């Protein structure tokens, strides 16, 4: 089955179905449906299997010809082979759904600066498709890995433009596909498939297949008695996973967090509530109230407050679709792709049109402008494409369809970023996040400690009095280490914890949150406005 693929499966179902699931004379009513799509991603996971399955679900000829099996030694035979296949597709259009499936177009497309015959090949298949446009039921699915690998000249409108990625290896789909694979394999009954799954970060389905493969392989190897029924044990499974190569590689944090895992600065909490989530009720609120929605807000606090936690809690308290934007997710070794993934995630926001998009630590996402004057050009290119795309606007004038994503950013070095970002019209609100006061310290200690083994001797208020210049993470690591001391030292197998260990751990973690740095931070990024 289409394990871990049914969502992309059905999206592509409707998309490619639109010309096929419904007749043509309506197109003849003055409409030209796009024809020819792209499936980009690591294959073997089911891409082939899924295109099979969907041509089935609609009812269509699974003409699963492998275009890599058409290479020619002399220019001209290749074009005749393509004539053969595309003509059979044409007679298929003469009969019904010509669901031509041609894989690995990029190997048939070495991009510019390459030799000549690629030109003949691509132009000739272009003739084929542009002519068969006249025919009634001509559709092709180029199956590759990355769209960038294909011919640029094959990405025009009225050409291969409807492109979709293979399924990103999600947890849910991971479990689905493990079960689907083993649905024909005699794995052991007791299987904590979720454990192995969460071990298999970044591992696409096919990787998981292969992993199970070698697992059962060594199972059969180091066992000989039950030659037919293997209890393919989770131990051999684990060891195989260990042996296996790591994965080759917009990850939304599935982890939900509420307003309880966070205390202090409830003023800023209510502010975020003001300028972000009330917009949900907006379609009638500003009506009886006037004021519009501020496009962009920028929350700034000292590095160490883990603002990301607050952002994720916000994303939790709204149910709105959420995607994250991080530099580590961004800094891939492909120059010119950062802008691309930016556009991609914004397009996804448009897709799940109610969308909240987070721009973390943008000083990392966008470094300095003119500090290193030799390698900071593509960064300004991302700057330009950002300043362009950040213009999400609508009718919004005196029922309403609230099709308007929202963008929120946060960082620690705003004095580094490009000043035009803060443009009234792009980022029309900025909020401050001071490190907690005595009360905030007390509260965040209380809430971070509500699961550690507490003893009847501690007095959090004293730490609060003395744990000044402490970040959230500071206090969290502090109570952590102190618990460790208490437990190990006294109770090798313990029950309680004493405050003495916190007192001792104080110096162990040197709090370098100098109040002068606080004043510097504040003055800088309050004049940043």
């Amino acid at each position: 089955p289409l394990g871990g693929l049914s969502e992309a499966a059905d999206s592509l179902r409707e998309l490619l179905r639109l010309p096929l699931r419904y007749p043509r004379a309506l197109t003849a009513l003055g409409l030209a449906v796009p024809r020819g799509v792209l499936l980009a991603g690591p294959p073997g996971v089911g891409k082939t299997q899924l295109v099979r399955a969907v041509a089935r679900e609609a009812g269509a000829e699974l003409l699963a010809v492998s275009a890599p099996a058409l290479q020619g030694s002399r220019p001209g035979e290749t074009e005749e082979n393509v004539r053969r296949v595309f003509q059979r597709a044409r007679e298929l259009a003469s009969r019904g759904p010509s669901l031509l499936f041609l894989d690995e177009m990029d190997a048939l497309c070495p991009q510019r600066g390459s030799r000549a015959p690629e030109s003949r090949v691509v132009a000739q298949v272009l003739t084929l498709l542009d002519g068969a446009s006249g025919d009634r039921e001509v559709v092709v699915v180029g199956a590759t890995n990355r769209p960038d690998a294909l011919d640029p000249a094959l990405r025009r409108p009225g050409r291969f433009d409807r492109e979709v990625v293979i399924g990103t290896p999600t947890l849910k789909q991971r479990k689905e596909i493990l079960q689907v694979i083993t649905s024909k394999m005699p794995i052991s009954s007791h299987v904590d498939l979720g454990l192995l799954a969460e071990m298999t970060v970044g591992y696409v389905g096919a990787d998981l297949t292969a992993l199970c493969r070698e697992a059962a392989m060594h199972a059969l190897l180091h066992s000989e008695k039950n030659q037919d029924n293997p209890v393919i044990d989770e131990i051999d499974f684990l060891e195989a996973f260990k042996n296996i190569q790591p994965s080759s590689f917009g990850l939304m944090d599935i982890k939900p967090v509420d307003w309880e895992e966070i205390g202090g600065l409830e003023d800023v909490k209510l502010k975020l509530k003001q300028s972000i989530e009330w917009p949900l009720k907006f379609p009638w609120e500003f009506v009886r109230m006037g004021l519009t929605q501020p496009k962009g807000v920028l929350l700034y606090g000292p590095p160490g407050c883990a603002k990301t936690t607050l952002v994720r809690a916000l994303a939790t308290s709204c149910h709105c679709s959420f995607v994250s934007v991080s530099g580590a997710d961004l800094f891939s070794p492909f120059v010119g792709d950062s802008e691309k993934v930016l556009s991609q995630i914004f397009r996804q926001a448009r897709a799940s049109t109610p969308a909240i998009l987070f721009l973390d630590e943008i000083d990392s996402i966008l470094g300095a402008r003119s500090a290193s004057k030799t390698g900071c050009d593509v960064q300004e290119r991302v700057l330009s494409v950002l300043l362009n795309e950040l213009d999400g606007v609508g009718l919004k004038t005196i029922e309403v369809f609230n099709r308007s994503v929202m963008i929120i950013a946060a960082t620690n070095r705003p004095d580094v970023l490009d000043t035009a970002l803060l443009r009234p019209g792009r980022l029309d609100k900025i909020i401050y996040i001071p490190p907690p006061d005595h009360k905030g310290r007390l509260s965040i200690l209380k809430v971070c400690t509500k699961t550690m083994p507490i003893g009847p001797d501690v007095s959090l208020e004293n730490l609060a009095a003395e744990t000044c210049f402490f970040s959230g993470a500071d206090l969290r690591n502090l109570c952590t280490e102190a618990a460790l001391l208490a437990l190990q030292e006294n109770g090798l197998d313990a029950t309680t914890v004493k405050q003495e260990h916190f007192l001792k751990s104080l110096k162990t973690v040197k709090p370098s949150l100098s109040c002068k740095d606080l004043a510097l931070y504040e003055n800088l990024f309050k004049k940043e406005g």
């Binding site: 639109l18 419904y22 007749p23 043509r24 004379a25 309506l26 009513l29 003055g30 409409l31 030209a32 449906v33 000549a116 030109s119 409108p157 003001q274 009330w278 009720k281 609120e285 009886r288 109230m289 006037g290 004021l291 448009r350 003119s370 004057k373 050009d377 300004e380 290119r381 362009n388 609508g394 009718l395 005196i398 369809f401 099709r403 000043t419 035009a420 009234p424």
Partner: protein, 545 residues
């Protein structure tokens, strides 16, 4: 395909211009020979992509008498060497035999890139051959009959010698369309599609299409058809194409969602917009209004004011004061009152990594300005580019280049035949007097802070969009809003509305106690010392009137 003038939308003036520059020769060339005055070899078309001038080309081609013949850059310039020229000369001669014919080329800069801007000497051989061929179009046997047509975005990357006379004289611009133009081309498209729309909300939809392009309008039409189709499908499970066709009727919401799904490709270049804001949107400014209308209307009186005495053609008016405080609003207001055209250039954006391309933008800006002569250039935040050199060693270079080229453009003050320039900034000192030297930008006005009546007018324009309570009292509001700016006070009442919303997510009227609360929260981040400095500069500067 029978591509007819009856299909091409907008561009009316340019249509007439091309039609006339081409028709008379292609009608009575022996009149031209009787005059002995030469017949124009070619005409250079230009304009950003998207508007696919090829439309115009094939249109005029199959319109009157032309035998079409087309060649395109990325279609011709392969790894051949002179075989490009071979194909070229062959087309040229064969269509010469076909004297009633017209050759066109797109991306003419592509086939012929810059000499210093390219490397492949083969391409320059092709350049030279094209030159020779075009002189073969200045040939006697067929004097002025092989009309060459060149069209590409970049006029810069073109080869200089192509501008030598008798080779490429008439440069016709086809820029991004305008509100009325968008509407026209949209109608001409929609001509043959069942729809249920009224031309007023249609004009609304047109207004929506900022930075939109024709080709993208066609894509919009197709998209909307598709989506209305989808809408119908979401009411019938199954059906044959007959009733489908019988029911598809494009409506407004269709177009709305359609436009909202696909974004256009324009809006990187300049655009001849139209001032939408009104004097009915700002309060007071009485003497400001009068002095401004005077400043803009005198340059047409200076014919007769010179007839009276004759002294000077004063042009440059410069406002200055607090930051963005309704100033640009006043600018657009005068713009709409005059009915002229607006070309905004926001200062700080002028910084681009592309060394000189900012200059290039300024250059095409002034070109279009001239082309639309009854128009007004605008500037804002001049001090951004006007940070003096030496501070930033590697950054102020493009800045001074840009400022120099700016002076170099404005120089055509005579050429600026009543083409006024309005600018405004906050700290006028930071500029160079190369702009404040007499003749160019001399009339100056400090924008006075809003008086009580202006504040009350701001309050009226605010209350006219929010349901407010009756405990309002304009008096003490105006009292406790001094040292503030208008837009700031708008934000104040906005936040008071937010506070009432905090009182209840479904309340109706905002309470003025919460207004006073907001007043306490908001602080005037502008000290009176700033006004002192403003008025001091006013006193210690050059001319005001």
């Amino acid at each position: 395909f029978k591509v007819t003038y009856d299909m091409i939308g907008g561009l009316s003036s340019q249509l007439k211009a091309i039609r006339e520059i081409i028709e008379l020769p292609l009608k009575q060339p022996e009149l031209f020979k009787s005059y002995g005055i030469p017949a124009p070899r070619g005409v250079l078309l230009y304009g950003p992509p998207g508007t696919g001038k090829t439309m115009i080309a094939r249109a005029v081609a199959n319109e009157v008498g032309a035998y079409v013949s087309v060649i395109n850059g990325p279609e011709i310039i392969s790894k051949f060497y002179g075989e490009t020229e071979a194909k070229l000369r062959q087309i040229f001669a064969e269509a010469t035999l076909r004297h009633p014919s017209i050759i066109f080329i797109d991306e003419l800069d592509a086939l012929c890139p810059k000499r210093e801007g390219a490397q492949n000497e083969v391409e320059k051989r092709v350049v030279a051959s094209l030159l020779t061929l075009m002189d073969g179009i200045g040939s006697e046997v067929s004097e002025g009959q092989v009309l060459v047509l060149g069209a590409t975005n970049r006029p810069h990357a073109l080869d200089a010698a192509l501008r030598r006379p008798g080779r490429f004289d008439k440069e016709i611009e086809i820029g991004v369309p305008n509100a009325q133009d968008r509407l026209d081309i949209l109608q001409k498209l929609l001509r043959r599609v069942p729809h249920l729309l009224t031309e007023a909300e249609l004009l609304q939809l047109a207004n929506s299409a900022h930075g939109y392009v024709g080709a993208d309008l066609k894509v919009l039409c197709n998209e909307a058809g598709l989506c209305a189709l989808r809408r119908i499908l979401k009411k019938q499970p199954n059906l044959p194409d007959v009733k489908v066709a019988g029911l598809v009727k494009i409506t407004l919401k269709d177009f709305l969602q359609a436009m909202n799904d696909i974004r256009p490709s324009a809006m990187r270049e300049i655009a001849i917009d139209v001032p939408n804001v009104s004097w009915s949107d700002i309060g007071g400014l009485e003497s400001i209004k009068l002095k401004l209308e005077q400043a803009v209307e005198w340059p047409l009186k200076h014919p007769e004011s010179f007839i009276r005495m004759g002294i000077q053609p004063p042009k440059g008016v410069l406002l200055y004061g607090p930051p963005g405080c309704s100033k640009t609003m006043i600018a657009k207001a005068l713009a709409n009152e005059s009915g002229l055209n607006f070309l905004a250039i926001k200062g700080p954006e002028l910084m681009n990594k592309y060394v000189g391309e900012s200059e290039r933008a300024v250059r095409e800006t002034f070109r279009k300005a001239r082309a639309v002569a009854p128009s007004i250039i605008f500037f804002d935040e001049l001090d951004a580019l006007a940070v003096e050199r030496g501070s930033s060693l590697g950054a102020g270079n493009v800045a001074d280049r840009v400022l120099a080229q700016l002076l170099t453009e404005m120089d055509g003050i005579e050429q600026l035949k009543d083409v006024t320039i309005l600018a405004a900034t906050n700290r006028p000192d930071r500029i160079d007097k190369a702009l404040m030297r007499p003749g160019r930008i001399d009339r100056i006005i400090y924008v006075p802070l809003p008086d009580a009546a202006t504040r009350r007018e701001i309050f009226k324009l605010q209350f006219h969009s929010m349901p407010v309570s009756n405990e309002v009292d304009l008096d003490e509001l105006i009292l406790q809003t001094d040292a503030y700016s208008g837009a700031e006070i708008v934000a104040v009442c906005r936040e008071a509305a937010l506070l009432a919303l905090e009182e209840d997510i479904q309340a109706n009227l905002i309470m003025k106690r919460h207004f006073t609360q907001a007043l306490s929260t908001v602080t005037p981040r502008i000290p009176e010392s700033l006004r002192r400095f403003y008025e001091d500069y006013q006193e210690k500067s050059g001319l005001h009137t």
